[PDB]
């Protein structure tokens, strides 16, 4: 994708009625992170799912480690959560030459405030000002009132932990229902006039 969503407003593409081989991503090896849960990454192109959800967003390098089942942290709890029984793959790569700008690429936002934690795969993109204190905000930013999101300082001089990374998470939904997303199971040449 030309552009990825902010982690607070991560995109979700529902994938159905199609075919692809997961090992392609593996083999290209453009990633710094490539970890699967539930399903092995080792060419598991023989599995079919009802749906596949490809979630995507941009975060800092030091945040990549939070995108996983069993994790806690500012993203894992308030921007993007994965379930304990998640089946899926987390792929991430350094996007410093795409998502960084001179002066800082502040087009990417993350949530700092919420009154509760997110559910697995919950997306909440509300811009209503958060009340941290006891008095009402009445739409005004101030001490004890925070517009819930903040931008990332994605500067050209950032060290690796502060460089932007593109994260794509593939959730594999297996239901007692007809499957629609499978891999391109390998075929061979037709051979005629011989025992086959």
């Amino acid at each position, epitope marked *: 994708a030309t552009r990825f969503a902010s982690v607070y407003a991560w995109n979700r593409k529902r994938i159905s009625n199609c075919v692809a081989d997961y090992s392609v991503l593996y083999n290209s090896a453009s990633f710094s992170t490539f970890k699967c849960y539930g399903v092995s990454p080792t060419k598991l192109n023989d599995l079919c799912f009802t749906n596949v959800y490809a979630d995507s967003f941009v975060i800092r390098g*030091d945040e990549v480690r939070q995108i996983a089942p069993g994790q*806690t*942290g*500012k993203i894992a709890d*308030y921007n993007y959560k994965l379930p304990d029984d998640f089946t899926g793959c987390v792929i991430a790569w350094n996007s410093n030459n795409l998502d960084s700008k001179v002066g800082g690429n502040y087009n990417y936002l993350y949530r*700092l*405030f919420r009154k509760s934690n997110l559910k697995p795969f919950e997306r909440d993109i509300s811009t209503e000002i958060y009340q*941290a*204190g006891s008095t009402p905000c009445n739409g005004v*930013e*101030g*001490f*004890n*009132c*925070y517009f819930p999101l*903040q931008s990332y300082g994605f500067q050209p001089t950032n*060290g690796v*932990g*502060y460089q932007p990374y593109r994260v794509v998470v593939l959730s594999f939904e297996l239901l007692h229902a007809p499957a629609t997303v499978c891999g391109p199971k390998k075929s061979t040449n037709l051979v005629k006039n011989k025992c086959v």
Partner: antibody
Amino acid sequence: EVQLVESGGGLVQPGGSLRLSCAASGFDLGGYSMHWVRQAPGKGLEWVAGIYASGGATAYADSVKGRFTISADTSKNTAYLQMNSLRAEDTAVYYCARSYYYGGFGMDYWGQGTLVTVSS
Amino acid sequence: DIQMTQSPSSLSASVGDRVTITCRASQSVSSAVAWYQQKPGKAPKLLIYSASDLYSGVPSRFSGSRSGTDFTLTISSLQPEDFATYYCQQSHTYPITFGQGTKVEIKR
């Protein structure tokens, strides 16, 4: 490189005043809140006051409310604490520190502080 | 007016040993709590901000995590330069309060 430098401490008589000043460099003040933090010898840290540099809005700890006023100047890239009617209870090392936005953020840079004492 | 309780007042762990200090907010502090390191005669240095963000210039040995209102301050392995009094600050709301300070010693 970001630096914060305190001045304006020293000995005052009770009921008198001292004006702390924090020079700053390496960043602007706008978009940040400037804060003063107090620490009595042998004690932990206490927030005293804060100002949002781009708004002029302030917040104060109850413990110094009324007696202290906080201000900042974005053209000068400096900030001040005006401490009036100083009490024996206000003897402490004062530090300037900064955090991003009005609040909700920790303090990245700290100066080394100055000692403020009150004694008859 | 969210108060912070820090425990223990002192902790011992020898060089190479792991340190965990717990900071408890009396109310939700969101993810606006910061961890500072103080040496005698010096201003507190920021180690970790907004609960889990390691501050640039701070050794990778420093880390931390959250459960509810409990903020765990962790040093994966102590070196002689890490024996300091550690403090938590709650920037979520005003006034800003701090914990009491935990002194780390060497298990002599």
